[PDB]
Structures are given as C-alpha cells and as structure tokens.
Design an enzyme around this catalytic site. Structure first.
Site, PDB file in Angstrom:
ATOM      1  N   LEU A  92       0.826  -1.196   0.000  1.00  0.00           N
ATOM      2  CA  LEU A  92       0.000   0.000   0.000  1.00  0.00           C
ATOM      3  C   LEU A  92       0.867   1.255   0.000  1.00  0.00           C
ATOM      4  O   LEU A  92       1.975   1.271   0.539  1.00  0.00           O
ATOM      5  CB  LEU A  92      -0.928  -0.007   1.216  1.00  0.00           C
ATOM      6  CG  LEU A  92      -1.902  -1.184   1.219  1.00  0.00           C
ATOM      7  CD1 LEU A  92      -2.508  -1.384   2.597  1.00  0.00           C
ATOM      8  CD2 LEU A  92      -2.985  -0.946   0.179  1.00  0.00           C
ATOM      9  N   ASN A 106      -2.694  -6.347   9.814  1.00  0.00           N
ATOM     10  CA  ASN A 106      -2.216  -7.316   8.834  1.00  0.00           C
ATOM     11  C   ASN A 106      -1.804  -8.598   9.541  1.00  0.00           C
ATOM     12  O   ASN A 106      -1.261  -8.547  10.649  1.00  0.00           O
ATOM     13  CB  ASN A 106      -1.041  -6.736   8.054  1.00  0.00           C
ATOM     14  CG  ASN A 106      -0.450  -7.716   7.070  1.00  0.00           C
ATOM     15  OD1 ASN A 106      -1.152  -8.246   6.216  1.00  0.00           O
ATOM     16  ND2 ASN A 106       0.863  -7.940   7.166  1.00  0.00           N
ATOM     17  N   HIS A 108       0.729 -11.817   9.180  1.00  0.00           N
ATOM     18  CA  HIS A 108       1.950 -12.201   8.486  1.00  0.00           C
ATOM     19  C   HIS A 108       2.429 -13.548   9.022  1.00  0.00           C
ATOM     20  O   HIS A 108       2.529 -13.728  10.252  1.00  0.00           O
ATOM     21  CB  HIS A 108       3.035 -11.132   8.663  1.00  0.00           C
ATOM     22  CG  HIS A 108       4.309 -11.441   7.941  1.00  0.00           C
ATOM     23  ND1 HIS A 108       4.491 -11.175   6.601  1.00  0.00           N
ATOM     24  CD2 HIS A 108       5.461 -12.010   8.373  1.00  0.00           C
ATOM     25  CE1 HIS A 108       5.702 -11.562   6.238  1.00  0.00           C
ATOM     26  NE2 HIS A 108       6.310 -12.072   7.297  1.00  0.00           N
ATOM     27  N   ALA A 140       2.187  -0.003   9.297  1.00  0.00           N
ATOM     28  CA  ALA A 140       2.895   1.257   9.156  1.00  0.00           C
ATOM     29  C   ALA A 140       3.484   1.329   7.752  1.00  0.00           C
ATOM     30  O   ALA A 140       3.510   0.344   7.011  1.00  0.00           O
ATOM     31  CB  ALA A 140       3.979   1.395  10.226  1.00  0.00           C
ATOM     32  N   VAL A 143       7.170  -1.729   5.494  1.00  0.00           N
ATOM     33  CA  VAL A 143       6.504  -3.021   5.339  1.00  0.00           C
ATOM     34  C   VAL A 143       6.861  -3.959   6.488  1.00  0.00           C
ATOM     35  O   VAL A 143       8.021  -4.048   6.911  1.00  0.00           O
ATOM     36  CB  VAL A 143       6.856  -3.651   3.979  1.00  0.00           C
ATOM     37  CG1 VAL A 143       6.227  -5.050   3.838  1.00  0.00           C
ATOM     38  CG2 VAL A 143       6.407  -2.752   2.843  1.00  0.00           C
ATOM     39  N   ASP A 144       5.844  -4.670   6.996  1.00  0.00           N
ATOM     40  CA  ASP A 144       5.999  -5.641   8.086  1.00  0.00           C
ATOM     41  C   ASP A 144       6.791  -5.060   9.260  1.00  0.00           C
ATOM     42  O   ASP A 144       7.546  -5.771   9.931  1.00  0.00           O
ATOM     43  CB  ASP A 144       6.644  -6.934   7.576  1.00  0.00           C
ATOM     44  CG  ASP A 144       5.815  -7.618   6.490  1.00  0.00           C
ATOM     45  OD1 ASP A 144       4.570  -7.508   6.533  1.00  0.00           O
ATOM     46  OD2 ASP A 144       6.403  -8.263   5.591  1.00  0.00           O
ATOM     47  N   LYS A 170      -1.324 -21.613   9.592  1.00  0.00           N
ATOM     48  CA  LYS A 170      -2.654 -21.032   9.394  1.00  0.00           C
ATOM     49  C   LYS A 170      -3.590 -21.356  10.561  1.00  0.00           C
ATOM     50  O   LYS A 170      -4.432 -20.533  10.931  1.00  0.00           O
ATOM     51  CB  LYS A 170      -3.258 -21.501   8.068  1.00  0.00           C
ATOM     52  CG  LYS A 170      -2.847 -20.634   6.856  1.00  0.00           C
ATOM     53  CD  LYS A 170      -3.432 -21.195   5.543  1.00  0.00           C
ATOM     54  CE  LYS A 170      -3.056 -20.327   4.326  1.00  0.00           C
ATOM     55  NZ  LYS A 170      -4.011 -20.508   3.166  1.00  0.00           N
TER      56      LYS A 170
END
Ligand SMILES: Nc1nc2sc(CCCCc3ccc(C(=O)N[C@@H](CCC(=O)O)C(=O)O)s3)cc2c(=O)[nH]1
Ligand SMILES: Nc1nc2sc(CCCCc3ccc(C(=O)N[C@@H](CCC(=O)O)C(=O)O)s3)cc2c(=O)[nH]1
Ligand SMILES: NCC(=O)N[C@@H]1O[C@H](COP(=O)([O-])[O-])[C@@H](O)[C@H]1O
Ligand SMILES: NCC(=O)N[C@@H]1O[C@H](COP(=O)([O-])[O-])[C@@H](O)[C@H]1O
Lengths: 200, 200
Positions: A92, A106, A108, A140, A143-144, A170
């Site tokens: 983004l 998010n 991850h 933020a 990234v990550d 998962k």
C-alpha cells in the site's frame, strides 16, 4: 467497529474473521470484502456469508496511489472503521497507510521481525528455524514493521515444506487474527500517542 | 563425548548442563569449565560439582587469535570433543571457529535470526514482540548465524523487563541446551557435508 477485509486469494483468514465476528460478543462486524484479484475463493466465502464484495483490479490503474484511492473510496462508502489485510498481497502507498494509521491490521506468517516479505515460509525453511509462527501487526508505511498486536509460535517439523508448514501456521493465524481484531474493535488495544501499542 | 563449557558469568546454563550430563543415559560428560572472567559464580558451580576450571583473562592477551589459542590449548589438554558456550560473552576468531566447526554449540536468548547480538532481550522489548524464545545453534564464523539445532518459544508479558523476561527465557534455555548437547553428543544430529544440519 465496521470492518473491511482485503484479500488476494483463498480467504481462510477471512473465513475465521467472519466466524468470530458472528459470535454474540463480537465488537466487530464485517461490512465489505475487497479483492484485488477476480474469481478467487475468498470472494465465494464472502458471498456465502452475505457480505458485499468488490473487486478492484490493481492492474487497471495508473499507479499505486490511484489504486489505493479506489480502495479508499469503497472504505468511505461503507463507513469503515478498521481494515484487515487477510492474504492481501499488494503493498500500500504511503498516504493511504498514513490515513489508516492505527486502524489497519495485517496477518503475516512469521514471528516478525524475522522473515519479512512475501515468501516467509520459504525463508523460514531455508534458514532452518525449528520455531516459526505468525504475527498480527498494525500497518505502518514500513513493510511488516508496524506495531505488533499478537503473535503465536508454531513448530517447524523435520521434512516440512511450504505446504505443510503453511497449513500448521494457518491454524494459528485463524486464532490470533480474530483475537487481535476483537482487541482493536473493542478499544482494548490502540496505537498510543508515542506511536507504540497501548493496552487500555 | 567429552565437553568443555565456556562461561562469562552466573552459570545457570552451566548448572543445567551439569545436571543433565549426570543422568545415566547422558552421552556427554563435562570435563572442563573455562571462564574469561575471574570470580564469577559459574566457577563456584563447577567447583562444587568437582569439575576442573580454568580462567583465561582475554584482557591479558595481544589479540583475539592469541586468546583463542590459549583456550584451544586447554581444550586439547583435556581431549575435548564438543564445546558449549554458556553465557560466554566474547566473539571467537575465525580460525578457532573453523577448527571447531560442527563441534561448538551456543545458547542465544532469542528466536534467531531475530535479535542477534549481546542485548537480545533489550531488542525484543524495544521491538514489542509478544513471543520471544531461545536458540541453540552451531557456531559458525558469522555471529549468531550458524546452523540451528533447537529453539523454544517464550511469551513476552505486558510490563516485562530484561529482568523478568530473561528469567522466563532461561527456564527454556535450561531445557533446550541440555537436549541439544545430548543430540550432538549422541551423534543424533551433526553438521552435514552440505554444511547444514543433518538428523542421523
Ligand atoms: N506500506 C505497507 N503496505 C503493506 S501491504 C501489507 C500486507 C501484505 C504484505 C506482503 C507483501 C510483500 C510484498 C508484496 C509485493 O511485492 N506485492 C507486489 C506484487 C503483487 C501483485 O501481483 O500485485 C505488488 O505490491 O505490486 S506483498 C503489509 C504492508 C505494510 O506493512 N506496509
Ligand atoms: N565467531 C563467532 N563467535 C561467537 S562467540 C558466541 C557466543 C556469544 C555471542 C554473544 C556476543 C555478541 C557480541 C559480544 C561482544 O561484543 N563481546 C565483546 C566484549 C566482551 C568482553 O568484555 O570481553 C568482545 O568479544 O570483545 S558477545 C557466538 C559466536 C558466533 O556465532 N560466531
Ligand atoms: N505477507 C503476507 C502473507 O504471506 N500472507 C499470508 O497469506 C496467507 C493467506 O491465506 P488465506 O487467503 O487463506 O487467508 C496467510 O498464510 C497469510 O499469513
Ligand atoms: N548472546 C549470548 C547471550 O546473551 N547469552 C545469554 O546470557 C545468559 C547467561 O546466563 P548464565 O550465565 O546463567 O548461563 C543466558 O541467558 C544466555 O542465553
């Protein structure tokens, strides 16, 4: 808290969020599912749950800002309070992340800060860790690298592949993502004024 | 397998290794404890267990190679097969690491590859992870970048400090370090010819 879930594929995390937000005590409701890719299974899961869907083909836009602007338009249309990235595989733009600072989560599939990026399982297997896991964090611009909300460790088994490791991780994602969303939607956790995570 | 344990301080990991290597089924025996610092508690633990000790004051040597050479002399004197770094806080020279390649283990209080270096707990707390842990790895020339043998995740609790986090992580260290030493001493695990970890 009205929630949008952005996806790019299968949508198992979306399904876990749908299931959790239908519990009577859920402080979140999912009002819209947005995919950057057509015909993915996550769109079927949304439709089966009666949740509106929108496909926004990033390939059809000039640049990242215009694409994000299209997402932002839908978020405003549905009066969204919180955005969950659930298998969303597009980076983004800065001003969109700024706008949703403290409101966008998010999932991850690693224990950040280890193994950032799009192939975390591959990195974990190449590195040889025996413990990996997953992370829910605030998004933020870096990234990550936003503030970590929850994590859960997951063992790596000998002979694991991306297939078998991602399956085990998962199961943990589907626990901490709904839990993290509930923490933010209930106001139990926020980004503090010093920009770090604040437990209210 | 004859083992040397190198220490720099309190020696709680040394104590756990001593305790485990006295179990009847232990494939390792600790024949020497080496400290780079005098009057540390780990030397008392060794002496109470009847294990010879040597202090090698790194400050008294010209450079890292000469200092390591003094360690290597003692290791040869005691016909050591495996070296455990248990709170040893000195970086080893290249040729010494090469010589002991595949025979030297280290305990590190993070889930490598996260938070390498001498202040892992400080980094973990500053970063805000909710899961940390510890790692036993083979020592390669690149610091905290040898092949991982075992790891154990440990939760971070809200309000944790270095004091409280290090206490919780040490309970895990005292499990995986003895277990990892047993795996190497029994020949269950070795460095493979491709340089990566091989489970025999
Ligand atoms: N600023 C900001 N944005 C984001 S997004 C997010 C959630 C996903 C992150 C995982 C990914 C890493 C790299 C990807 C990538 O290279 N994607 C390409 C190709 C995809 C396509 O086929 O389109 C593209 O973006 O062009 S995706 C976290 C996050 C954040 O922390 N900060
Ligand atoms: N080559 C190689 N060597 C080693 S050693 C090891 C176990 C400990 C690592 C933790 C540390 C990180 C940095 C330290 C440091 O800066 N120490 C100073 C000051 C100490 C003193 O007061 O003397 C010094 O070394 O001068 S200690 C792992 C390891 C490895 O992976 N590769
Ligand atoms: N860096 C982002 C990333 O790797 N995301 C990962 O993609 C999968 C999506 O599965 P799903 O579509 O079934 O939720 C999940 O494992 C998620 O952690
Ligand atoms: N990078 C090395 C490092 O940080 N080592 C750490 O020092 C402590 C020693 O305690 P002890 O003297 O009681 O075993 C242990 O926590 C170990 O993981």
């Amino acid at each position: 808290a009205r929630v949008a879930v952005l996806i790019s594929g299968t949508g198992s995390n979306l399904q876990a969020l749908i299931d959790s937000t239908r519990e009577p005590n859920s402080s979140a409701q999912i009002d819209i599912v947005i995919s950057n890719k057509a015909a993915v299974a996550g769109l079927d899961k949304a439709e089966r749950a009666g949740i509106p869907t929108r496909v926004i083909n990033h390939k059809l836009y000039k640049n990242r800002v215009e694409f994000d602007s299209a997402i932002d338009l839908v978020l405003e249309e549905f009066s969204i309070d919180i955005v969950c990235l659930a298998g969303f595989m597009r980076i983004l733009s800065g001003p969109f992340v700024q706008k949703w600072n403290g409101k966008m989560l998010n999932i991850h599939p690693s224990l950040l800060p280890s193994f950032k990026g799009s192939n975390a399982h591959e990195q974990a297997l190449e590195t040889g860790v025996t413990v990996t896991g997953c992370t829910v964090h605030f998004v933020a611009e870096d990234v990550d690298a936003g503030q970590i909300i929850l994590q859960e460790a997951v063992p790596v088994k000998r002979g694991d592949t991306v297939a078998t490791l991602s399956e085990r991780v998962k199961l943990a994602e589907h626990k901490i993502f709904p839990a993290a969303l509930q923490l933010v939607a209930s106001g139990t956790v926020q980004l503090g004024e010093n920009g770090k995570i604040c437990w209210v």
